[PDB]
C-alpha cells in the first residue's frame, strides 16, 4: 500500500518565513526525500517540519515505505524577493531537448516564457515549453543557439520579471566526418636520416579520435600533438610522427586515421628508406647518332638521382662543353627524383664527329653514359691519277664510306677504284647518301 500524506494536496503553497509541516502515514514508513535541481536531502522522521520556510525550500517532497513505494507533494514558497531558482549551467546536445533550470517559487503567475538578453529577440525557430516545477525546455537545440543568452520571465502585478542570466552552450552532433590531410604524400630518405611527417585533422569537436598506425602492423607509434580551437565548432589537430634514425625496415605505408561517431577517414603516406643513393640513367635516343655536316643534333638523357644530383656536366674529347646544354627536373613535384639534361649541337661540323659523355654525381654515386656522333659528309675526290699501266685510280673520302664509278663518252672512310681504259672523257663519280662529287680527265691520239 503506497504511503499516504497529510496535507492531502498535490501542490501546496506557503508564505516565506512560515512553517512547513508534512506527515506521512504508512506502517512501513522509511524515508522522506526532498529534491530541487541538484540539491537532495534524506530524512527518517515520520513527519517533516521546517518552521522557517525559505525560497530555497521550494521543491518536491517524497515519502517512501519498506514496500518500496512512494507518494509525493510539491511545495512552493511565496517570496517576493526570489521568484526563480537557478543553476546557471546549461548544456545541450545538438538536436536534443534541453532544460533551463529556472523553476518558480510561486505557481500562481502568468506568461512563464523565455527571453533574450540585452533586448535581443530570441531566434524565430527556437521554441520551448514551460513547467513551473522544473524550468523551461527548449526543443531541438541547434548550433545557432551556441552561447545564446537567455532569461526566464514571469508576470506579477502586471510587471514583468526576469531571472539571473543564462547562457546556452551546444555540444555538436556529428553529421559529417573528419577531414584529414598529410603534409607530404611520399617520402624517400637515406638510411639514418630523421623522418618527420605531419598530419592534420579538422572537425567540429575535439572528441575526434586520431592515430598513426603502420599498415599490416597493429602496434601504436609514438606521436606528438598540437590542437587549436578556431572559433565556434571549428577544431584543428596536428599530429607528428617521427623516427629519429630511419632504418631500411622502416620503409612501408603509414596511415593517419581519424574516426568520429559518424565515421572514419584515412590518409596514407609511403616511405622508402634506402641504404645508399643511386643514379640510374636512361638515354632517350640510341647511344649512336648520325648527322649531316651543318645539320643539328640533340643528345638527351633522363636520369633518376637521389640524393639530389650535385654536378652534371658534358664533355667532348676530354674537354668540358659549356653553354650549349640545358637541364630541368622532369616534374616540379616534391616527390620527383628525376632530371632531364640535353646538349644541343647546332650546325655541326664533320670534324666533331666523335664521343660525347655525360657525367653526373651526388654525394654517394657517380654515373656516366656515352654518346657517339658520326657526322656524315658528301664525298670528295681527293686524288686522281693516270698510271703507267694504262690504268687509273681515284680516291674518295667521306662517311658513310663512298662509292666510285667510271664513265666514258671516327671520321671519313676512304675508298678507291682502279680501271684501265686505254676520243674523249673519263670520269670518276663519287657518292653516298649525303652527296655526290665528280672528277674528269681526257686523253687523245693524233
Amino acid at each position: 500500500s503506497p504511503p499516504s500524506i497529510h496535507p492531502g494536496k498535490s501542490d501546496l503553497i506557503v508564505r516565506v518565513g512560515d512553517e512547513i509541516r508534512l506527515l506521512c502515514t504508512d506502517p512501513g514508513f522509511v524515508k522522506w526525500t526532498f529534491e530541487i535541481l541538484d540539491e537532495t536531502n534524506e530524512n527518517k522522521q515520520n513527519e517533516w517540519i521546517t518552521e522557517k520556510a525559505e525560497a530555497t525550500n521550494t521543491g518536491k517532497y517524497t515519502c517512501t515505505n519498506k514496500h518500496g513505494l512512494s507518494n509525493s507533494i510539491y511545495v512552493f514558497v511565496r517570496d517576493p524577493a526570489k521568484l526563480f531558482l537557478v543553476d546557471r549551467s546549461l548544456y545541450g546536445k545538438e538536436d536534443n531537448d534541453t532544460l533551463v533550470r529556472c523553476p518558480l517559487t510561486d505557481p500562481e503567475v502568468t506568461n512563464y516564457s523565455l527571453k533574450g538578453c540585452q533586448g535581443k529577440p530570441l531566434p524565430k525557430d527556437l521554441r520551448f515549453i514551460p513547467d513551473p516545477k522544473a524550468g523551461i525546455m527548449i526543443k531541438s537545440v541547434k548550433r545557432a543557439y551556441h552561447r545564446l543568452c537567455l532569461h526566464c520571465s514571469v508576470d506579477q502585478e502586471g510587471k514583468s520579471v526576469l531571472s539571473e542570466k543564462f547562457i546556452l552552450k551546444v555540444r555538436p552532433a556529428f553529421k559529417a566526418v573528419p577531414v584529414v590531410s598529410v603534409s607530404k604524400a611520399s617520402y624517400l630518405l637515406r638510411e639514418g636520416e630523421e623522418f618527420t611527417v605531419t598530419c592534420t585533422i579538422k572537425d567540429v569537436s575535439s572528441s575526434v579520435y586520431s592515430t598513426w598506425k603502420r599498415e599490416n602492423s597493429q602496434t601504436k607509434l609514438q606521436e606528438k600533438y598540437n590542437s587549436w580551437h578556431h572559433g565556434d565548432f571549428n577544431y584543428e589537430r596536428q599530429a607528428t610522427l617521427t623516427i629519429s634514425s630511419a632504418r631500411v625496415n622502416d620503409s612501408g605505408v603509414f596511415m593517419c586515421y581519424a574516426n568520429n561517431t559518424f565515421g572514419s577517414a584515412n590518409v596514407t603516406t609511403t616511405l622508402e628508406v634506402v641504404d645508399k643513393g643511386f643514379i640510374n640513367i636512361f638515354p632517350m635516343i640510341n647511344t649512336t647518332v648520325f648527322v649531316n655536316d651543318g645539320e643539328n643534333v640533340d643528345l638527351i638523357v633522363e636520369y633518376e638521382a637521389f640524393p639530389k644530383p650535385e654536378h652534371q656536366q658534358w664533355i667532348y674529347m676530354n674537354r668540358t662543353f659549356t653553354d650549349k646544354w640545358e637541364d630541368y627536373p622532369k616534374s616540379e613535384n616534391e616527390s620527383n627524383i628525376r632530371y632531364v639534361s640535353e646538349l644541343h649541337l647546332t650546325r655541326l661540323k664533320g670534324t666533331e664527329g666523335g664521343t660525347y659523355t655525360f657525367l653526373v654525381s651526388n654525394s654517394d654515386v657517380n654515373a656516366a653514359i656515352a654518346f657517339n656522333v658520326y657526322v656524315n659528309t658528301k664525298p670528295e675526290i681527293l686524288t686522281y691519277d693516270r698510271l703507267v699501266n694504262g690504268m687509273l685510280q681515284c680516291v674518295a673520302a667521306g662517311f658513310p664510306e663512298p662509292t666510285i664509278d667510271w664513265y666514258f663518252c671516327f671520321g671519313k672512310l676512304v675508298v678507291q677504284s682502279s680501271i684501265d681504259s686505254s676520243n674523249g672523257t673519263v670520269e670518276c663519280k663519287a657518292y653516298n647518301d649525303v652527296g655526290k662529287t665528280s672528277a674528269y680527265f681526257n686523253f687523245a691520239f693524233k
Binding site: 540539491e39 546557471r88 549551467s89 548544456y91 552561447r147 547562457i167 552552450k169 555540444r171 569537436s205 575535439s206 572528441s207 600533438y225 598540437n226 590542437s227 587549436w228 580551437h229 572559433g231 577544431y235
Partner: protein
Amino acid sequence: ICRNRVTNNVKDVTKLVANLPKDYMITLKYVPGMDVLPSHCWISEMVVQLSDSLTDLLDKFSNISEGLSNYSIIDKLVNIVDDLVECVKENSKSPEPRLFTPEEFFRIFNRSIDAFKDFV
C-alpha cells in the same frame, strides 16, 4: 583520458594576464584548499565554476578582427573548460564567492588544467 581535450591555446593565458589590469577583480566560487586537498577532490567542482567565471569575463570584452584580443583568448579558454566539463561528467554544495586579481585567478586556472592531465 581528456589530456587530449585541452587544446594548446592555454599558452595564450600569459598574454591574457598581461592585458588585464593588475587590480581588476574576477569572481570565482573557490572550492576550499584545492592548493591543499588532492587533485581529484576539487577538480569536478572547479572546472564547472571556472566555466561560469570565464563566460562572465567573456561578457566584459568586445571583439576586434585584426590581431589577438582578450575576447579571442577567453573565447577559446571557455571552449577548453566546457569540453573538460563534458569529459568529467562522462569519464567519472557551492563554495562561497571569492575575488581574485587576474594573476591569482589564472594561477587557479592553470592549476586545474595541470590537474587534468593525470586523472583517473
